[PDB]
Amino acid sequence: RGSFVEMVDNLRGKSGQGYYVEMTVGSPPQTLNILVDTGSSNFAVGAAPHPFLHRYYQRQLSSTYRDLRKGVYVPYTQGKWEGELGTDLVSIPHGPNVTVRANIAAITESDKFFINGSNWEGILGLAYAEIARPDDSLEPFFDSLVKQTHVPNLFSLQLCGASVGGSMIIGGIDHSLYTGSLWYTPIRREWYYEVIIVRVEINGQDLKMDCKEYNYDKSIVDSGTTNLRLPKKVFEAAVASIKAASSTEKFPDGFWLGEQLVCWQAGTTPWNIFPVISLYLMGEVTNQSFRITILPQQYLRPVEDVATSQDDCYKFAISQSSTGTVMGAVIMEGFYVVFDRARKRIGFAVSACHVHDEFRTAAVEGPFVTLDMEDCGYN
């Protein structure tokens, strides 16, 4: 408990491409890099020679592979994959020292799924069976891990943004990964890691929206999404106060819609004209909340692949949603995030590694008094 040196620094990534962990599947073990995703629930790996893939799972080489004789077809909003279900022995080399028999979807066809130039070739869905494909009887990896071993039913994520890195602590919390105190918000329902946002401030100014709007139709914590996505009506209001707060420069409207980059002369980004964003989350106690605050260092993402520009270019990375609030890598990179499944709660603490400056830092502060927090949840 509290100290897991072998697991610190076990994540890697490139900006724009997510955070992956090394895993092994089958006997003898095949090493694969696997995207860590708290917004889905299937363990799914490339299992054929798609040109974008460095490595893929070769079931024929594994003596402990068992076929389930069932296909799975998984379309997303963007992209899809299709695959064949089975089980096999799975370990995490920089993880707990155990091996478990997990479901694996061997991906045999995909579209707009793998990223060309990325270093990962599957996904580890860490959310709950309720959203597993094809249905909730396909037990997710972390459920198998907890059933089969003595690993405590929790994991924690420290995502360090821009090469990126971080730590996934499986079965525990490592106190060297955060400063000050953890504050917990209840998991409203076990499917996604769904939470409830009770108030939103831009530079300390309240948006003053009916709080149910913040959670329409849910709010989730998702390591497999880069952006902070906000429900359309909330995004319109939040961009409007952000534009106002940042008045002392003017940008094309396109910038705010993520339709254009903005660039500055290297080493001169004026962070200070951009406001901080705070989300108050439902706390553990009736009428009690806490707040997390992120910086423009989190929501202005650097874009390297600008082979038609010389300078320091950024994407505005808060965007409108039709799926509810998504607290993606934009939120998570400020924090050490504890997925405390055993107590159905998610903890946040200021990350010991988040990107900040001399004037402002990401922050997790409480308690605050907030009434009618149960009305904020959408039904």
Ligand X SMILES: C[C@]1(c2cc(NC(=O)c3ccc(C#N)cn3)ccc2F)N=C(N)OC[C@@H]1F
Write out the catalytic residue numbers: 37, 222
Residue range at the interface with Na ion (CB under 5 A); choices 55-63, 154-162, 177-185, 187-195: 177-185
User: Distances in Å between the alpha carbon of 80 and those of 75, 112, 180?
Assistant: 4, 7, 41
Q: Which residue number places its CB atom closest to ligand X?
A: 39
Q: Considering the complex, state which of residue 175 and residue 243 has its C-beta at the smaller distance from Na ion.
A: 175
- Number of other residues whose CB lies within 10 A of the CB of residue 59: 18
Question: What's the sign of the alpha-carbon dihedral 183, 291, 168, 180?
Answer: negative
Q: Which does 225 bind (CB under 5 to 8 A by kind): Na ion, ligand X, none?
A: ligand X
What does 226 bind: Na ion, ligand X, none (CB cut-off 5 to 8 Å by kind)?
ligand X
Min separation Cβ 174 and Na ion, Å: 9
Among the candidate windows 87-95, 172-180, 182-190, 363-371, which touches Na ion by CB under 5 A? 172-180
Residue 185 has which token pair? Answer: 């918000």
Q: Count Cβ neighbours within 10 Å for each residue of 187-219 and write b for 16 or more, e otherwise.
A: bbeebbbbbbbbbbbbeeeebebebbbbbbebb
Give least dist CB 74 to ligand X, A: 8
Nearer to ligand X, 225 or 297 (CB): 225
Provide the 3-class DSSP secondary structure of residue 38. coil
Answer with the entry of Na ion, ligand X, none that 18 interacts with (C-beta below 5 to 8 A by kind): ligand X
The tokens for 277 are: 């964003």
How buried is residue 184: exposed, middle or buried, by Cβ count under 10 Å (0-12/13-18/19+)? buried
Diameter over CA atoms, the chain: 64
Give, for 62, the enclosing helix (H) or strand (E): none
Residue 172 interface partner, choices ligand X, Na ion, none, CB cut-off 5-8 Å depending on type: none
Number of residues binding to Na ion, judged by CB under 5 A: 2
CB closer to ligand X, 13 vs 283: 13
- Going by their DSSP bridges, the two strands 288-294 and 205-206 should be labelled as unpaired
By CB under 5 A, tell whether 175 contacts Na ion: yes
Residue 101 as a binder of Na ion (CB under 5 A): the answer is: no
- Binding stretches for ligand X (CB under 6 A): 16-18, 35, 37, 39-40, 76, 79, 113, 115, 123, 222, 224-226, 329
Q: Which amino acid is at 131?
A: I
Binding site for Na ion (CB under 5 A): 175, 178
